[PDB]
């Protein structure tokens, strides 16, 4: 009568993925992730073997192990006020390659040569770059560009 028993049930989610594509991009099973690579519950489209609530989205724990499945993470369930327990992670279709540990280490770590130059030089170091301070009084010109007075066109009554 129903659809369970031996091998059935769950008629809500039933396959794959897409996005980039070249397989899953053939470099997942090859390289071994370490401390920093987070396996956010990504690629759940076909990995909903007990799909959680729609509330669990965004939170993250701390990676401690990398293997076949995924890494260990937490999802501070901000339900009502504070955050509940629990850890999560994700299957294998949600395994990613975070670029947050790439671009951030190609701008700050790249300026390591400017740090080792103060004692034998004279202060003025660190990569604490200035955001965007307001410009002061600059010097401009006029010769070479004759000013022109413009005016908005007379918008008449028409369909």
């Amino acid at each position: 009568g129903k659809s369970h028993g031996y091998r059935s049930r769950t008629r809500y989610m039933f396959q794959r993925d897409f996005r980039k594509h070249g397989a899953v991009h053939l470099s997942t099973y090859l390289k071994v992730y370490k401390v920093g690579d987070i396996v956010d519950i990504k690629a759940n489209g076909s990995i909903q073997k007990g799909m959680p609530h729609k509330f669990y989205q965004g939170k993250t724990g701390v990676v401690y192990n990398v293997t076949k499945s995924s890494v260990g993470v937490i999802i501070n369930k901000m339900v009502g006020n504070r955050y509940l327990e629990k850890r999560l992670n994700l299957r294998v279709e949600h395994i990613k390659h975070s670029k947050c540990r790439q671009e951030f280490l190609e701008r700050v770590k790249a300026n390591a040569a400017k740090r080792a130059e103060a004692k034998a030089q004279g202060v003025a170091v660190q990569l604490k770059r200035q955001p965007a301070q307001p410009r002061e009084s600059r010097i401009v010109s006029t010769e070479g560009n004759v000013p022109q007075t413009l005016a908005p066109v007379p918008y008449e009554t028409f369909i």
Partner: protein
């Protein structure tokens, strides 16, 4: 053929080419996946592979290190090394690839730390055996290959190139199911017939049916051999003395060279045309609105 079908312009949207090495055909991701790329159980490891490409049965051996960015060729063994020694022709057979495998096991070995170690046998009789490496220290070296195509068959100069390298100290866990003289029925090995493809016994065998049977192609086939007086048992002495040239000086001496990349940098643009800028060729641009596409 689009002169009959004539597809639309909206049909070309989901178009996606493969590798450059796919259309032209150079790289495959089903054999290389287990050649260059590997699990991080070994991490950074200079996995040297041997690239072999026999065009017109020409000896070509290349050694390229496994690098994801910037490939560096360690060594290379072509067919322009045997005429340097003394071997004119007869370098397109299995015996030539057998000597090449031994030659590449001495040239690359010279820059591989020491040359005294990793040898084996020098008698050359054709016998399936395992090289005994030095206990505690010098581990048995394993050479990797790199091909792509070429059907899995017996009696291959390409496949038998590892056999010639096996007698050079290079320890590779291979089998004996594909030797020139193997029976498909039982699992017995015949080293007697195997020797025939080493000293060129199969080559002189066909010559026996030319001075009594096939006389029509007698003047055609086997012509370069008569120029070097090769018809009797002199052919056997060629591959025999070929091993002496291997341990001679495997340093690979350059050829004539004569003016490399300097004086020969001006030859192409002397007869052909080039895509010159439109700012200089305004005579051809203004001609389009004349009679070329401006109706007379």
């Amino acid at each position: 053929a689009f002169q009959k079908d004539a597809k639309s312009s909206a049909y070309s949207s989901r178009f996606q080419t493969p590798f450059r090495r796919r259309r032209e055909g150079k790289t495959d991701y089903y054999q290389r996946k287990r050649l260059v790329t590997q699990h991080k159980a070994k991490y950074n490891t200079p996995k040297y592979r041997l690239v072999v490409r026999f065009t017109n049965k020409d000896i070509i051996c290349q050694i390229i290190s496994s690098t994801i960015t910037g490939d560096v060729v360690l060594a290379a063994a072509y067919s322009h090394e045997l005429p340097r020694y003394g071997i004119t022709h007869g370098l397109t057979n299995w015996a030539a690839a057998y000597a090449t495998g031994l030659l590449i096991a001495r040239r690359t070995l010279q820059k591989l730390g020491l040359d005294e170690t990793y040898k084996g046998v020098e008698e050359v009789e054709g016998e399936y055996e395992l090289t005994e490496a030095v206990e505690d220290g010098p581990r048995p070296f394993k050479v990797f290959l790199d091909i792509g195509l070429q059907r899995t068959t017996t009696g291959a100069r390409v496949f038998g190139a590892l056999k010639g390298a096996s007698d050079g100290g290079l320890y590779v866990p291979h089998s004996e199911n594909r030797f020139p003289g193997w029976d498909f029925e039982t699992e017995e090995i015949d080293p007697e017939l195997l020797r025939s493809y080493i000293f060129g016994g199969h080559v002189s065998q066909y010559m026996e049916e030319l001075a009594d049977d096939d006389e029509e192609r007698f003047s055609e086939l086997f012509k370069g051999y008569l120029a070097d007086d090769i018809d009797a048992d002199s052919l056997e002495d060629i591959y025999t003395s070929a091993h002496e040239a291997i341990r001679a000086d495997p340093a690979f001496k350059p050829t004539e060279k004569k003016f490399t990349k300097e004086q020969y940098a001006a030859e192409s643009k002397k007869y052909r045309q080039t895509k010159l800028s439109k700012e200089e060729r305004a005579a051809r641009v203004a001609a389009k609105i004349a009679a070329l596409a401006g109706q007379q």
